[PDB]
Amino acid sequence: EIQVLKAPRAVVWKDFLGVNAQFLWFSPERYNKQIDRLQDLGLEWVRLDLHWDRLETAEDQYQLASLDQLVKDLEARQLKSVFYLVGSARFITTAPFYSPFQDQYPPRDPEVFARRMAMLSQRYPSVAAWQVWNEPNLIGFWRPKADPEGYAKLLQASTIALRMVDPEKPVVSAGMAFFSEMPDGRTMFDALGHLGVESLGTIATYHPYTQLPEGNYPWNLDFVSHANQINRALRNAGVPAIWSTEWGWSAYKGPKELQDIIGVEGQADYVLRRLALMSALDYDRIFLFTLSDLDQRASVRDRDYGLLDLDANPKPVYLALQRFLKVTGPKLRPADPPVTEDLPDGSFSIGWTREDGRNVWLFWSARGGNVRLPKLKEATLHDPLSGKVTPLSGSDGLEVPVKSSLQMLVWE
Ligand SMILES: C[C@@H]1O[C@@H](O[C@H]2[C@H](O)[C@@H](CO)NC[C@@H]2O)[C@H](O)[C@H](O[C@@H]2O[C@H](CO)[C@@H](O)[C@H](O[C@@H]3O[C@H](CO)[C@@H](O)[C@H](O)[C@@H]3O[C@H]3O[C@H](CO)[C@@H](O)[C@H](O)[C@@H]3O)[C@@H]2O)[C@H]1O
Ligand SMILES: [Cl-]
Ligand SMILES: [Cl-]
Ligand SMILES: [Cl-]
């Protein structure tokens, strides 16, 4: 069962591939070093989390100094930022008095939240887009149960308030967990659609984390199918844009909590394979989770999603992504794979052209094996995980080794 992808449009990495970032967890010295490493990749989009109960610690009493300095720094470094605000301040929460998760409940009055997003947008005009809440389909962000009507009211109040500040600035709806599935068996995209939320014209976004790059189980690699189905439905509903605001894997050692243990090399492999899929699907922009490893304030799994370690130095996934983007160059146009014979069962196959006009073939298969390219006499094979570069030549076609990990064939 071979999966061939051809992107719907050209991809310019600087415009398309952003990273999540937790810069408020770090000193400016440290986060500026993270930004150096991001710029070295040729990227500029960042997505940052804001927690209302950290920003407003009592009614009308705020802690803005670190955020003020961060926004100044992001503007000085010429990054493009989307910030999301999530959680309830203590004075406004619907949490019962005894809950240990006071901010994981929605606000008693959505207009109060809306006024804070307007205050942030007015304070920080350099921010490129504002996002309303996070994963409202997940209990840990919206207790005690998912509530499409409640989220729709929150998104409407926020959209109106943000547009009063700046009618041109994008309003991004919350990144939905997974493909927006809810515990009750509905999906938040379907439920919001039945409420007519598309009339608000917010950017739609979801967080399609799966165990493997191409699906959750080896016998059901349905990531492409599932993403295509959700993205077609969002386009049919008239969304202005589709982003994926989080995806990725943790290099953590364990103990296992949801994600299987794959380590730094598994992180590098899986991120590159998933990037090869998502950059050929119908997203306008995607954001890898996440730029940096985090300290003990994060959950054990959440500490190790970084491109960078705690010193802001490259992990294997950063070096692999760097090699991949150097091979592609800055802009890819959709193309077709080379003609193949005996491409292995289960292969993934994506063709592009680079700015120099040469073709790039991204391919892999769990079975490994070999493939014949009968019409080529010359090409170069790059393994972004190891850095190996292999010139291939044949009088009557090429034989190319296929790996479980992504390789890139560059050919004329
Ligand atoms: C960077 C990370 O991003 C988001 O989480 C990602 C997650 O990392 C990935 C991978 O697992 N999955 C998708 C998801 O989007 C969140 O922004 C994370 O922040 C959280 O935001 C919640 C809503 O504001 C907070 O409730 C949450 O707070 C933690 O709660 C756990 C218990 O569930 C505590 O163990 C932990 O200490 C945190 O609680 C402190 O902070 C709360 C928020 O200020 C306070 O209300 C609480 O009293 C504690 O001081 C977390 O902040 C984000 O980290
Ligand atoms: Cl942050
Ligand atoms: Cl915050
Ligand atoms: Cl060919």
Q: How far is the CA of 286 from the centre of ligand 2 (A)?
A: 18
Please name the residue whose Cα sits nearest to atom 46 of ligand 1: 103
Q: Tokens 């990749």 label which residue?
A: 41
Which residues, by Cβ under 5 Å, contact ligand 2, an ion?
A: 22-24, 48
**Token pair of 243 as six digits:** 């982003």
User: Does residue 181 sit within a domain?
Assistant: yes
Q: Which residues contact 352 (CB under 8 A, 6 or more apart)?
A: 7, 11, 328, 332, 333, 334, 335, 359, 360, 362
User: Does residue 104 sit within a domain?
Assistant: yes
**Token pair of 26 as six digits:** 């770090």
Q: Do 352 and 243 belong to one domain?
A: no
Q: For residue 86, give the ligand nearest its CA.
A: 1
Please name the residue whose Cα sits nearest to atom 10 of ligand 1: 302
Q: Do 242 and 359 belong to one domain?
A: no
Query: Is residue 168 within 8 Å of residue 201, measured between CB atoms?
Result: no
User: Does residue 285 sit within a domain?
Assistant: yes
User: Does residue 355 sit within a domain?
Assistant: yes
Phi and psi of 87, rounded to 5°?
A: 85, 160
Q: How many CB atoms lie within 10 A of CB 29?
A: 8
Cross-strand pairs, 348: 3, 364
> Which residues constitute the domain of residue 298?
11-330
The structure's method of determination equals X-ray
> Using CA atoms, how far apart are residues 46 and 35, in angstroms rounded to an integer?
10
Q: Do 287 and 339 belong to one domain?
A: no
Q: Do 383 and 397 belong to one domain?
A: yes
Q: Is 90 in the pocket of ligand 1 (CB under 6 A)?
A: no
Q: Do 359 and 286 belong to one domain?
A: no
- In total, how many domains does the chain have? 2
Residue to probe by mutation, ligand 1, list 103, 172, 294, most atoms within 8 Å of CB: 103
Q: Is 302 in the pocket of ligand 1 (CB under 6 A)?
A: yes
Query: Is residue 215 within 8 Å of residue 274, measured between CB atoms?
Result: no
What share of residues in the chain are helix, strand, coil (percent, to 5)? 30, 25, 40
Cross-strand pairs, 363: 349, 407
> Using CA atoms, how far apart are residues 165 and 133, in angstroms rounded to an integer?
18
Q: Do 81 and 196 belong to one domain?
A: yes
Last residue of a domain, one of 310, 330, 350: 330
Residue to probe by mutation, ligand 1, list 52, 181, 302, 305, most atoms within 8 Å of CB: 302
Residue 92: half-sphere exposure toward Cβ, Cα within 13 Å = 22
Q: How far is the CA of 177 from the centre of ligand 2 (A)?
A: 19
> Using CA atoms, how far apart are residues 387 and 249, in angstroms rounded to an integer?
21
> Using CA atoms, how far apart are residues 148 and 183, in angstroms rounded to an integer?
12
β-strands 56-58, 61-62: how paired? antiparallel
Q: Do 267 and 361 belong to one domain?
A: no
Q: Which residues contact 139 (CB under 8 A, 6 or more apart)?
A: 104, 145, 146, 183
**Conformational region of residue 49, where left means phi above 0, alpha means psi within -120 to 50, and beta covers everything else:** beta
> Using CA atoms, how far apart are residues 405 and 276, in angstroms rounded to an integer?
11
β-strands 17-21, 45-51: how paired? parallel
**Which ligand 1 atom minimizes the distance to the CA of 104?**
26
User: Where are the extended beta strands (E) located within 233-301?
Assistant: 242-244, 285-288
Nearest to 327 by CA among 347, 350, 355, 286: 355
Helix locations, 180-246, DSSP H: 188-194, 223-236
Last residue of a domain, one of 330, 353, 377: 330
Last residue of a domain, one of 305, 330, 355: 330
Q: Do 171 and 295 belong to one domain?
A: yes
Q: Is 53 in the pocket of ligand 1 (CB under 6 A)?
A: yes
Residues in the chain: 412
User: Does residue 72 sit within a domain?
Assistant: yes
- The single-letter code of the amino acid at 99 is S
User: Does residue 315 sit within a domain?
Assistant: yes
Q: Do 212 and 100 belong to one domain?
A: yes
Q: For residue 377, give the ligand nearest its CA.
A: 4
